[PDB]
mmCIF file of C-alpha atoms and ligand atoms in Angstrom:
data_model
loop_
_atom_site.group_PDB
_atom_site.id
_atom_site.type_symbol
_atom_site.label_atom_id
_atom_site.label_comp_id
_atom_site.label_asym_id
_atom_site.label_seq_id
_atom_site.Cartn_x
_atom_site.Cartn_y
_atom_site.Cartn_z
ATOM 1 C CA UNK A 1 97.824 160.732 135.783
ATOM 2 C CA UNK A 2 96.449 157.040 135.117
ATOM 3 C CA UNK A 3 93.446 158.835 134.610
ATOM 4 C CA UNK A 4 93.190 162.153 133.416
ATOM 5 C CA UNK A 5 89.204 163.615 134.237
ATOM 6 C CA UNK A 6 87.540 166.500 132.840
ATOM 7 C CA UNK A 7 84.422 167.771 134.334
ATOM 8 C CA UNK A 8 82.665 171.092 133.457
ATOM 9 C CA UNK A 9 81.000 172.868 136.333
ATOM 10 C CA UNK A 10 78.630 176.268 135.108
ATOM 11 C CA UNK A 11 79.064 179.202 137.037
ATOM 12 C CA UNK A 12 82.722 181.518 138.024
ATOM 13 C CA UNK A 13 83.143 183.466 141.079
ATOM 14 C CA UNK A 14 82.272 182.306 144.192
ATOM 15 C CA UNK A 15 80.465 178.732 144.005
ATOM 16 C CA UNK A 16 83.171 178.435 140.972
ATOM 17 C CA UNK A 17 85.782 177.977 143.277
ATOM 18 C CA UNK A 18 84.535 176.092 145.471
ATOM 19 C CA UNK A 19 83.950 173.002 142.125
ATOM 20 C CA UNK A 20 87.782 173.743 141.224
ATOM 21 C CA UNK A 21 88.632 173.576 145.041
ATOM 22 C CA UNK A 22 87.521 169.916 145.154
ATOM 23 C CA UNK A 23 88.767 168.927 142.218
ATOM 24 C CA UNK A 24 92.052 170.363 143.160
ATOM 25 C CA UNK A 25 92.448 168.452 147.015
ATOM 26 C CA UNK A 26 90.897 165.343 144.966
ATOM 27 C CA UNK A 27 93.197 165.437 142.434
ATOM 28 C CA UNK A 28 96.135 166.593 144.908
ATOM 29 C CA UNK A 29 95.646 163.812 147.625
ATOM 30 C CA UNK A 30 94.900 161.017 144.560
ATOM 31 C CA UNK A 31 98.112 159.891 142.769
ATOM 32 C CA UNK A 32 96.369 158.757 140.072
ATOM 33 C CA UNK A 33 92.845 160.572 139.443
ATOM 34 C CA UNK A 34 93.888 164.330 137.535
ATOM 35 C CA UNK A 35 89.798 166.780 137.454
ATOM 36 C CA UNK A 36 90.369 169.037 134.694
ATOM 37 C CA UNK A 37 88.145 171.080 136.002
ATOM 38 C CA UNK A 38 86.511 173.589 133.381
ATOM 39 C CA UNK A 39 83.591 176.426 133.289
ATOM 40 C CA UNK A 40 81.398 176.634 131.004
ATOM 41 C CA UNK A 41 77.924 178.026 131.243
ATOM 42 C CA UNK A 42 75.552 176.158 132.686
ATOM 43 C CA UNK A 43 77.847 173.639 132.007
ATOM 44 C CA UNK A 44 76.461 174.149 127.863
ATOM 45 C CA UNK A 45 72.899 172.421 129.044
ATOM 46 C CA UNK A 46 70.783 175.035 129.912
ATOM 47 C CA UNK A 47 67.924 177.273 127.562
ATOM 48 C CA UNK A 48 69.345 180.096 125.299
ATOM 49 C CA UNK A 49 67.883 182.148 123.070
ATOM 50 C CA UNK A 50 71.065 181.456 120.221
ATOM 51 C CA UNK A 51 69.975 178.644 117.041
ATOM 52 C CA UNK A 52 69.073 175.988 119.856
ATOM 53 C CA UNK A 53 72.566 174.251 119.364
ATOM 54 C CA UNK A 54 74.167 173.711 123.096
ATOM 55 C CA UNK A 55 77.089 173.385 123.889
ATOM 56 C CA UNK A 56 77.628 169.602 126.269
ATOM 57 C CA UNK A 57 75.057 168.746 123.641
ATOM 58 C CA UNK A 58 77.708 169.802 120.606
ATOM 59 C CA UNK A 59 80.439 167.936 122.468
ATOM 60 C CA UNK A 60 78.505 164.966 123.379
ATOM 61 C CA UNK A 61 77.859 164.565 119.446
ATOM 62 C CA UNK A 62 82.156 164.826 118.708
ATOM 63 C CA UNK A 63 82.740 162.380 120.798
ATOM 64 C CA UNK A 64 85.140 163.495 123.371
ATOM 65 C CA UNK A 65 82.560 164.811 125.701
ATOM 66 C CA UNK A 66 83.312 165.831 129.659
ATOM 67 C CA UNK A 67 83.269 163.093 131.991
ATOM 68 C CA UNK A 68 81.476 164.328 134.517
ATOM 69 C CA UNK A 69 78.953 168.235 134.116
ATOM 70 C CA UNK A 70 77.728 169.714 137.138
ATOM 71 C CA UNK A 71 73.850 171.276 135.612
ATOM 72 C CA UNK A 72 72.586 174.101 137.218
ATOM 73 C CA UNK A 73 69.286 172.713 138.034
ATOM 74 C CA UNK A 74 66.770 169.295 138.202
ATOM 75 C CA UNK A 75 65.003 170.500 134.928
ATOM 76 C CA UNK A 76 67.120 169.449 131.905
ATOM 77 C CA UNK A 77 67.584 165.635 133.241
ATOM 78 C CA UNK A 78 64.698 164.497 131.276
ATOM 79 C CA UNK A 79 65.575 165.636 127.900
ATOM 80 C CA UNK A 80 68.568 164.255 128.388
ATOM 81 C CA UNK A 81 68.438 161.115 129.407
ATOM 82 C CA UNK A 82 64.964 160.309 126.715
ATOM 83 C CA UNK A 83 68.417 161.288 123.921
ATOM 84 C CA UNK A 84 70.280 159.023 125.639
ATOM 85 C CA UNK A 85 73.269 162.273 126.462
ATOM 86 C CA UNK A 86 73.992 160.795 129.636
ATOM 87 C CA UNK A 87 74.380 157.036 130.981
ATOM 88 C CA UNK A 88 71.611 155.888 133.550
ATOM 89 C CA UNK A 89 73.676 155.113 136.946
ATOM 90 C CA UNK A 90 71.980 152.191 138.503
ATOM 91 C CA UNK A 91 74.285 149.878 138.344
ATOM 92 C CA UNK A 92 76.470 152.600 140.316
ATOM 93 C CA UNK A 93 73.879 153.612 143.126
ATOM 94 C CA UNK A 94 72.250 149.922 143.867
ATOM 95 C CA UNK A 95 74.630 149.271 146.996
ATOM 96 C CA UNK A 96 74.265 153.431 146.979
ATOM 97 C CA UNK A 97 72.091 154.492 150.390
ATOM 98 C CA UNK A 98 70.279 157.091 148.448
ATOM 99 C CA UNK A 99 67.938 156.890 151.077
ATOM 100 C CA UNK A 100 70.636 159.862 153.430
ATOM 101 C CA UNK A 101 69.398 162.491 149.942
ATOM 102 C CA UNK A 102 66.871 164.708 150.317
ATOM 103 C CA UNK A 103 63.919 162.422 149.188
ATOM 104 C CA UNK A 104 62.278 165.571 146.654
ATOM 105 C CA UNK A 105 65.945 165.817 145.802
ATOM 106 C CA UNK A 106 66.606 161.856 144.330
ATOM 107 C CA UNK A 107 62.934 161.474 143.049
ATOM 108 C CA UNK A 108 64.334 163.937 140.124
ATOM 109 C CA UNK A 109 66.721 161.911 139.364
ATOM 110 C CA UNK A 110 64.401 159.762 138.098
ATOM 111 C CA UNK A 111 63.351 158.927 134.423
ATOM 112 C CA UNK A 112 61.614 156.044 132.297
ATOM 113 C CA UNK A 113 62.542 153.866 135.404
ATOM 114 C CA UNK A 114 66.107 154.786 135.879
ATOM 115 C CA UNK A 115 68.463 156.626 137.624
ATOM 116 C CA UNK A 116 70.439 159.772 135.530
ATOM 117 C CA UNK A 117 72.032 161.944 138.504
ATOM 118 C CA UNK A 118 73.076 163.297 141.293
ATOM 119 C CA UNK A 119 71.875 166.000 143.882
ATOM 120 C CA UNK A 120 74.792 168.381 144.077
ATOM 121 C CA UNK A 121 72.984 171.067 146.361
ATOM 122 C CA UNK A 122 69.292 171.316 147.430
ATOM 123 C CA UNK A 123 68.082 175.242 146.315
ATOM 124 C CA UNK A 124 64.847 177.294 147.362
ATOM 125 C CA UNK A 125 64.113 180.936 145.823
ATOM 126 C CA UNK A 126 62.744 183.700 148.506
ATOM 127 C CA UNK A 127 62.025 187.324 148.537
ATOM 128 C CA UNK A 128 65.232 189.755 149.557
ATOM 129 C CA UNK A 129 64.236 192.986 150.622
ATOM 130 C CA UNK A 130 66.532 196.521 151.257
ATOM 131 C CA UNK A 131 65.987 197.365 154.715
ATOM 132 C CA UNK A 132 66.789 200.570 154.368
ATOM 133 C CA UNK A 133 65.522 201.766 151.447
ATOM 134 C CA UNK A 134 62.414 200.452 153.158
ATOM 135 C CA UNK A 135 62.502 203.197 155.914
ATOM 136 C CA UNK A 136 63.291 205.618 153.243
ATOM 137 C CA UNK A 137 60.076 204.439 152.106
ATOM 138 C CA UNK A 138 58.297 204.620 155.325
ATOM 139 C CA UNK A 139 57.597 200.996 155.232
ATOM 140 C CA UNK A 140 58.487 198.940 158.126
ATOM 141 C CA UNK A 141 61.612 197.721 157.166
ATOM 142 C CA UNK A 142 60.984 193.789 159.014
ATOM 143 C CA UNK A 143 57.994 193.142 157.261
ATOM 144 C CA UNK A 144 57.909 191.950 153.536
ATOM 145 C CA UNK A 145 54.821 192.478 151.505
ATOM 146 C CA UNK A 146 52.949 189.264 151.808
ATOM 147 C CA UNK A 147 51.002 189.489 149.191
ATOM 148 C CA UNK A 148 51.429 190.665 145.084
ATOM 149 C CA UNK A 149 49.219 193.462 145.174
ATOM 150 C CA UNK A 150 51.149 194.603 148.256
ATOM 151 C CA UNK A 151 54.367 193.825 146.540
ATOM 152 C CA UNK A 152 53.576 196.270 143.867
ATOM 153 C CA UNK A 153 52.290 198.839 146.376
ATOM 154 C CA UNK A 154 55.364 198.922 147.522
ATOM 155 C CA UNK A 155 57.506 198.793 144.894
ATOM 156 C CA UNK A 156 55.379 201.848 143.541
ATOM 157 C CA UNK A 157 56.941 203.977 147.235
ATOM 158 C CA UNK A 158 60.569 202.282 146.710
ATOM 159 C CA UNK A 159 60.786 203.586 142.933
ATOM 160 C CA UNK A 160 62.783 206.876 142.673
ATOM 161 C CA UNK A 161 62.981 209.327 139.158
ATOM 162 C CA UNK A 162 65.210 212.664 139.086
ATOM 163 C CA UNK A 163 63.560 214.368 136.206
ATOM 164 C CA UNK A 164 61.977 211.770 134.335
ATOM 165 C CA UNK A 165 65.008 209.306 135.717
ATOM 166 C CA UNK A 166 64.784 206.610 136.456
ATOM 167 C CA UNK A 167 67.650 205.999 140.004
ATOM 168 C CA UNK A 168 65.504 203.479 142.274
ATOM 169 C CA UNK A 169 63.854 200.597 141.071
ATOM 170 C CA UNK A 170 61.432 199.237 143.796
ATOM 171 C CA UNK A 171 61.088 195.906 142.077
ATOM 172 C CA UNK A 172 61.582 194.133 138.384
ATOM 173 C CA UNK A 173 59.150 190.928 138.486
ATOM 174 C CA UNK A 174 61.637 189.814 135.552
ATOM 175 C CA UNK A 175 65.224 190.140 137.459
ATOM 176 C CA UNK A 176 67.438 187.955 139.362
ATOM 177 C CA UNK A 177 65.277 184.466 139.550
ATOM 178 C CA UNK A 178 62.213 185.914 138.170
ATOM 179 C CA UNK A 179 62.813 183.756 134.925
ATOM 180 C CA UNK A 180 58.895 182.548 133.352
ATOM 181 C CA UNK A 181 59.766 178.759 134.987
ATOM 182 C CA UNK A 182 60.106 179.901 138.622
ATOM 183 C CA UNK A 183 56.688 182.348 138.030
ATOM 184 C CA UNK A 184 54.894 179.901 136.371
ATOM 185 C CA UNK A 185 54.370 177.654 139.803
ATOM 186 C CA UNK A 186 54.211 181.118 141.405
ATOM 187 C CA UNK A 187 51.227 181.894 140.112
ATOM 188 C CA UNK A 188 50.332 178.425 140.336
ATOM 189 C CA UNK A 189 50.786 177.775 136.990
ATOM 190 C CA UNK A 190 53.709 175.584 134.412
ATOM 191 C CA UNK A 191 54.617 175.540 131.348
ATOM 192 C CA UNK A 192 53.518 171.921 130.187
ATOM 193 C CA UNK A 193 51.053 170.033 131.060
ATOM 194 C CA UNK A 194 50.157 166.220 132.623
ATOM 195 C CA UNK A 195 51.912 164.945 129.430
ATOM 196 C CA UNK A 196 54.683 167.057 129.681
ATOM 197 C CA UNK A 197 53.703 169.098 126.244
ATOM 198 C CA UNK A 198 53.707 173.363 125.276
ATOM 199 C CA UNK A 199 50.623 175.181 127.737
ATOM 200 C CA UNK A 200 51.772 178.356 126.415
ATOM 201 C CA UNK A 201 48.843 179.887 124.659
ATOM 202 C CA UNK A 202 46.525 181.902 126.346
ATOM 203 C CA UNK A 203 43.705 179.524 125.246
ATOM 204 C CA UNK A 204 45.349 176.320 126.120
ATOM 205 C CA UNK A 205 47.074 178.347 129.984
ATOM 206 C CA UNK A 206 44.944 181.419 130.637
ATOM 207 C CA UNK A 207 47.221 181.784 134.734
ATOM 208 C CA UNK A 208 49.699 181.935 131.774
ATOM 209 C CA UNK A 209 48.601 185.505 130.471
ATOM 210 C CA UNK A 210 47.993 186.423 133.810
ATOM 211 C CA UNK A 211 51.125 185.989 135.287
ATOM 212 C CA UNK A 212 52.964 187.993 131.904
ATOM 213 C CA UNK A 213 50.620 191.023 132.055
ATOM 214 C CA UNK A 214 51.842 191.287 135.267
ATOM 215 C CA UNK A 215 54.915 191.409 134.398
ATOM 216 C CA UNK A 216 54.501 193.695 131.555
ATOM 217 C CA UNK A 217 52.451 196.205 133.946
ATOM 218 C CA UNK A 218 56.019 197.222 135.319
ATOM 219 C CA UNK A 219 56.568 197.620 131.324
ATOM 220 C CA UNK A 220 53.538 200.045 130.810
ATOM 221 C CA UNK A 221 53.867 201.656 133.785
ATOM 222 C CA UNK A 222 57.687 202.697 134.780
ATOM 223 C CA UNK A 223 58.276 202.323 130.920
ATOM 224 C CA UNK A 224 60.652 199.618 129.036
ATOM 225 C CA UNK A 225 63.523 201.589 127.466
ATOM 226 C CA UNK A 226 63.290 203.613 130.934
ATOM 227 C CA UNK A 227 63.717 199.764 133.095
ATOM 228 C CA UNK A 228 66.308 198.875 130.164
ATOM 229 C CA UNK A 229 68.323 201.582 130.424
ATOM 230 C CA UNK A 230 68.333 201.966 134.075
ATOM 231 C CA UNK A 231 69.222 198.218 134.348
ATOM 232 C CA UNK A 232 72.197 198.410 131.456
ATOM 233 C CA UNK A 233 75.304 196.630 132.223
ATOM 234 C CA UNK A 234 74.068 195.061 135.555
ATOM 235 C CA UNK A 235 73.546 190.818 135.527
ATOM 236 C CA UNK A 236 70.160 190.458 135.253
ATOM 237 C CA UNK A 237 69.717 186.543 135.965
ATOM 238 C CA UNK A 238 72.708 185.831 138.377
ATOM 239 C CA UNK A 239 74.442 186.894 141.716
ATOM 240 C CA UNK A 240 77.766 188.710 140.853
ATOM 241 C CA UNK A 241 78.691 191.994 142.344
ATOM 242 C CA UNK A 242 77.058 193.446 139.528
ATOM 243 C CA UNK A 243 74.034 192.172 140.389
ATOM 244 C CA UNK A 244 70.659 195.425 140.593
ATOM 245 C CA UNK A 245 69.933 194.240 144.278
ATOM 246 C CA UNK A 246 73.991 193.859 145.597
ATOM 247 C CA UNK A 247 74.173 197.450 143.924
ATOM 248 C CA UNK A 248 71.366 198.413 145.636
ATOM 249 C CA UNK A 249 69.250 199.575 142.783
ATOM 250 C CA UNK A 250 66.165 197.930 143.220
ATOM 251 C CA UNK A 251 64.882 197.018 146.953
ATOM 252 C CA UNK A 252 63.646 193.774 146.754
ATOM 253 C CA UNK A 253 64.507 190.950 144.013
ATOM 254 C CA UNK A 254 63.135 187.553 144.194
ATOM 255 C CA UNK A 255 66.354 185.046 143.561
ATOM 256 C CA UNK A 256 68.174 182.113 145.059
ATOM 257 C CA UNK A 257 69.121 180.953 148.834
ATOM 258 C CA UNK A 258 72.365 181.444 147.723
ATOM 259 C CA UNK A 259 71.945 185.249 147.436
ATOM 260 C CA UNK A 260 72.682 185.808 150.574
ATOM 261 C CA UNK A 261 76.534 185.113 149.482
ATOM 262 C CA UNK A 262 76.874 187.761 147.085
ATOM 263 C CA UNK A 263 74.816 190.398 149.620
ATOM 264 C CA UNK A 264 77.794 189.903 151.714
ATOM 265 C CA UNK A 265 80.550 189.379 150.127
ATOM 266 C CA UNK A 266 79.890 192.072 147.467
ATOM 267 C CA UNK A 267 78.354 194.934 149.676
ATOM 268 C CA UNK A 268 78.636 194.651 153.309
ATOM 269 C CA UNK A 269 76.750 197.305 154.494
ATOM 270 C CA UNK A 270 73.879 196.410 152.289
ATOM 271 C CA UNK A 271 71.193 196.016 155.072
ATOM 272 C CA UNK A 272 68.582 193.231 153.876
ATOM 273 C CA UNK A 273 66.000 190.437 154.597
ATOM 274 C CA UNK A 274 65.572 187.396 153.398
ATOM 275 C CA UNK A 275 61.692 186.165 153.488
ATOM 276 C CA UNK A 276 59.393 183.749 151.592
ATOM 277 C CA UNK A 277 57.962 185.072 147.286
ATOM 278 C CA UNK A 278 55.158 187.107 148.065
ATOM 279 C CA UNK A 279 51.172 185.339 147.046
ATOM 280 C CA UNK A 280 49.910 185.776 143.578
ATOM 281 C CA UNK A 281 46.294 185.419 142.895
ATOM 282 C CA UNK A 282 45.939 181.964 142.154
ATOM 283 C CA UNK A 283 48.994 180.880 143.407
ATOM 284 C CA UNK A 284 49.684 179.352 146.695
ATOM 285 C CA UNK A 285 50.804 181.001 149.945
ATOM 286 C CA UNK A 286 54.809 181.730 150.536
ATOM 287 C CA UNK A 287 55.289 179.897 146.962
ATOM 288 C CA UNK A 288 58.934 178.431 146.891
ATOM 289 C CA UNK A 289 60.530 176.378 143.843
ATOM 290 C CA UNK A 290 62.396 173.365 145.508
ATOM 291 C CA UNK A 291 65.556 172.028 142.995
ATOM 292 C CA UNK A 292 69.023 172.169 142.666
ATOM 293 C CA UNK A 293 71.777 171.443 141.242
ATOM 294 C CA UNK A 294 72.669 167.896 139.320
ATOM 295 C CA UNK A 295 76.361 166.013 138.616
ATOM 296 C CA UNK A 296 75.179 164.151 135.700
ATOM 297 C CA UNK A 297 78.076 161.379 133.842
ATOM 298 C CA UNK A 298 77.503 162.012 130.266
ATOM 299 C CA UNK A 299 77.550 159.094 126.935
ATOM 300 C CA UNK A 300 81.036 159.714 126.245
ATOM 301 C CA UNK A 301 82.396 159.658 129.303
ATOM 302 C CA UNK A 302 85.911 158.037 128.934
ATOM 303 C CA UNK A 303 85.670 157.544 133.159
ATOM 304 C CA UNK A 304 82.750 156.967 134.372
ATOM 305 C CA UNK A 305 83.410 154.990 137.682
ATOM 306 C CA UNK A 306 86.339 157.354 137.987
ATOM 307 C CA UNK A 307 83.864 159.632 138.289
ATOM 308 C CA UNK A 308 81.621 158.570 140.619
ATOM 309 C CA UNK A 309 84.395 157.759 143.072
ATOM 310 C CA UNK A 310 84.876 161.976 142.661
ATOM 311 C CA UNK A 311 81.631 162.164 143.415
ATOM 312 C CA UNK A 312 81.401 160.233 146.402
ATOM 313 C CA UNK A 313 84.341 161.749 148.378
ATOM 314 C CA UNK A 314 82.028 164.990 147.406
ATOM 315 C CA UNK A 315 79.173 164.184 150.069
ATOM 316 C CA UNK A 316 81.327 163.110 152.680
ATOM 317 C CA UNK A 317 78.427 164.879 155.511
ATOM 318 C CA UNK A 318 81.004 167.289 156.794
ATOM 319 C CA UNK A 319 82.765 167.492 153.231
ATOM 320 C CA UNK A 320 79.911 168.846 151.399
ATOM 321 C CA UNK A 321 78.505 170.490 155.068
ATOM 322 C CA UNK A 322 81.593 172.540 154.294
ATOM 323 C CA UNK A 323 80.672 173.168 151.093
ATOM 324 C CA UNK A 324 77.178 174.230 151.421
ATOM 325 C CA UNK A 325 78.004 176.420 154.359
ATOM 326 C CA UNK A 326 80.723 178.212 151.543
ATOM 327 C CA UNK A 327 78.007 178.673 148.769
ATOM 328 C CA UNK A 328 75.064 179.615 150.606
ATOM 329 C CA UNK A 329 73.449 176.063 149.862
ATOM 330 C CA UNK A 330 71.180 173.676 151.425
ATOM 331 C CA UNK A 331 73.259 170.659 151.456
ATOM 332 C CA UNK A 332 71.267 167.747 149.233
ATOM 333 C CA UNK A 333 72.101 165.136 152.061
ATOM 334 C CA UNK A 334 69.925 164.923 155.269
ATOM 335 C CA UNK A 335 73.082 164.360 157.857
ATOM 336 C CA UNK A 336 75.372 166.879 155.938
ATOM 337 C CA UNK A 337 71.799 169.248 156.804
ATOM 338 C CA UNK A 338 71.590 168.982 160.005
ATOM 339 C CA UNK A 339 75.134 169.647 160.266
ATOM 340 C CA UNK A 340 75.642 172.949 158.540
ATOM 341 C CA UNK A 341 77.434 175.809 160.529
ATOM 342 C CA UNK A 342 74.401 177.929 158.388
ATOM 343 C CA UNK A 343 71.976 176.683 160.695
ATOM 344 C CA UNK A 344 72.923 179.708 163.438
ATOM 345 C CA UNK A 345 73.616 182.178 160.104
ATOM 346 C CA UNK A 346 69.746 184.964 160.550
ATOM 347 C CA UNK A 347 69.379 184.944 156.929
ATOM 348 C CA UNK A 348 70.184 181.088 156.338
ATOM 349 C CA UNK A 349 67.627 180.886 158.744
ATOM 350 C CA UNK A 350 64.829 181.954 157.259
ATOM 351 C CA UNK A 351 66.105 180.427 154.432
ATOM 352 C CA UNK A 352 64.808 177.359 156.212
ATOM 353 C CA UNK A 353 61.386 178.184 157.519
ATOM 354 C CA UNK A 354 60.720 178.843 153.618
ATOM 355 C CA UNK A 355 61.868 175.386 152.842
ATOM 356 C CA UNK A 356 59.787 173.449 155.904
ATOM 357 C CA UNK A 357 57.313 175.746 155.995
ATOM 358 C CA UNK A 358 56.415 177.846 151.997
ATOM 359 C CA UNK A 359 54.350 175.523 149.498
ATOM 360 C CA UNK A 360 56.769 173.989 147.874
ATOM 361 C CA UNK A 361 56.947 173.046 144.099
ATOM 362 C CA UNK A 362 59.249 171.190 142.084
ATOM 363 C CA UNK A 363 59.948 171.755 137.906
ATOM 364 C CA UNK A 364 57.827 169.295 136.824
ATOM 365 C CA UNK A 365 59.850 166.881 134.155
ATOM 366 C CA UNK A 366 59.439 166.839 129.959
ATOM 367 C CA UNK A 367 61.871 165.397 127.472
ATOM 368 C CA UNK A 368 61.371 168.773 125.663
ATOM 369 C CA UNK A 369 61.074 171.643 128.744
ATOM 370 C CA UNK A 370 64.591 173.276 127.877
ATOM 371 C CA UNK A 371 62.794 174.156 124.641
ATOM 372 C CA UNK A 372 59.259 174.915 125.660
ATOM 373 C CA UNK A 373 61.467 176.888 128.923
ATOM 374 C CA UNK A 374 63.270 179.133 125.410
ATOM 375 C CA UNK A 375 59.945 179.302 123.256
ATOM 376 C CA UNK A 376 58.571 180.850 126.711
ATOM 377 C CA UNK A 377 61.677 182.715 128.142
ATOM 378 C CA UNK A 378 61.263 184.636 124.299
ATOM 379 C CA UNK A 379 57.951 185.885 124.631
ATOM 380 C CA UNK A 380 58.282 187.069 128.189
ATOM 381 C CA UNK A 381 61.458 189.695 126.911
ATOM 382 C CA UNK A 382 59.036 190.116 123.250
ATOM 383 C CA UNK A 383 56.131 191.377 125.905
ATOM 384 C CA UNK A 384 58.097 193.081 127.851
ATOM 385 C CA UNK A 385 60.359 194.984 125.205
ATOM 386 C CA UNK A 386 57.163 195.987 123.915
ATOM 387 C CA UNK A 387 57.518 193.994 120.120
ATOM 388 C CA UNK A 388 54.956 191.809 120.378
ATOM 389 C CA UNK A 389 51.287 192.201 123.437
ATOM 390 C CA UNK A 390 51.129 189.691 126.316
ATOM 391 C CA UNK A 391 48.408 187.450 124.199
ATOM 392 C CA UNK A 392 50.373 187.335 120.962
ATOM 393 C CA UNK A 393 53.811 187.056 122.306
ATOM 394 C CA UNK A 394 51.875 184.010 123.530
ATOM 395 C CA UNK A 395 50.527 182.705 121.250
ATOM 396 C CA UNK A 396 54.011 183.174 118.670
ATOM 397 C CA UNK A 397 55.489 181.237 122.017
ATOM 398 C CA UNK A 398 52.544 178.093 121.836
ATOM 399 C CA UNK A 399 53.791 177.401 118.198
ATOM 400 C CA UNK A 400 57.771 177.466 118.393
ATOM 401 C CA UNK A 401 57.529 175.576 121.046
ATOM 402 C CA UNK A 402 55.413 173.287 119.126
HETATM 403 O O1 LIG B 1 75.398 181.887 141.476
HETATM 404 C C1 LIG B 1 75.532 180.571 141.892
HETATM 405 C C2 LIG B 1 74.196 179.648 142.094
HETATM 406 O O2 LIG B 1 73.622 179.321 141.225
HETATM 407 C C3 LIG B 1 72.543 178.239 141.059
HETATM 408 O O3 LIG B 1 71.983 178.616 139.944
HETATM 409 C C4 LIG B 1 71.330 179.126 138.854
HETATM 410 C C5 LIG B 1 72.583 180.206 138.132
HETATM 411 O O4 LIG B 1 73.161 181.206 138.231
HETATM 412 C C6 LIG B 1 71.404 181.473 136.962
HETATM 413 O O5 LIG B 1 71.112 182.429 138.127
HETATM 414 C C7 LIG B 1 70.683 180.615 136.292
HETATM 415 O O6 LIG B 1 69.873 181.088 136.060
HETATM 416 O O7 LIG B 1 69.644 180.309 137.419
HETATM 417 C C8 LIG B 1 70.682 178.973 137.619
HETATM 418 C C9 LIG B 1 69.022 178.248 139.364
HETATM 419 O O8 LIG B 1 68.191 177.419 138.211
HETATM 420 C C10 LIG B 1 72.892 177.440 141.586
HETATM 421 O O9 LIG B 1 73.957 176.952 140.629
HETATM 422 C C11 LIG B 1 72.950 177.722 143.464
HETATM 423 O O10 LIG B 1 73.384 176.465 143.266
HETATM 424 C C12 LIG B 1 74.451 178.259 142.988
HETATM 425 O O11 LIG B 1 74.718 178.614 144.690
#
């Protein structure tokens, strides 16, 4: 076709299918535009444990990057913008009524006086629990823990061992969305300061150490190697048919609202609750990170106007409401969110209450966020694996982040 537009999206499965379907329908109905949709994990943008690198930044350097990317968060935009790896959208957007977007979602697109993306979906973090497993412990299946202390107590009651072998875990702090850049906010702290500089060491961020020591209390109590053997093969930090909650192997898990989708599709018999994350010592009641997916146009995009035209088409209120319902996300346009069919879904109503009544926090906007995340991620893993003390792991992380 006249315009061949390459799109990168960041996950396979149902979410991937939804994006592929959007691209396919647009292409079918537009004789002069074809969209080649390609799944590259984390859009090649997400922080990885590898040697820095990154498939997106590599593609930008190589000179033929995708014309459009869909990334799964709001944490990467400042760094990509500062590097000049994505183009400003201000002229494309000047005559677009951006008041239609949720304020917080659109505000995250702003960096150094320019606009560098558009919100594709809005996400929040919640607690999932297995009601059948609660009943087996003599816990009220309709009442989740309100504090981390309560969570820890319930978790012990919900852990099963047979002849020394773990058969069921009550809770594993670091799986699902229990990642450092989420849990920091739950504990009322951050990975960076007001200037965007890393605050990872115990002497720079005592509360971060508190969080890590709490996580490691699980490693010490249940056994680090035991936990790792128990969850071997399972999807540790993404919603899948084989994530530990869907498999019924962990009784409670912190995840995104989207997790409802995986639960329903892959384990229809799974009897689960959805509710607020329990309050941490030093954190606010019912904490939740509000973020979302982000469209960006890479530096090197051959077809920025056509990319923008496709985005606009995906943003049709009914269309995006339908997309949001399909993937169990919150539509990023206020009008669309209000008409979503999931407004009448029992699980999603709990999600909307979190969005409306929870103590909402946001990822800080920092150009070095992703490298700071990598340093924090490595430290948390090292401590969980007992390769370092939590204290030394975080000291090491500070040096790496700097
Ligand atoms: O799993 C589909 C949802 O993915 C979300 O992004 C996740 C990503 O899958 C992974 O788990 C990573 O560790 O965290 C991301 C959130 O920060 C969102 O893209 C959501 O919209 C999808 O429905």
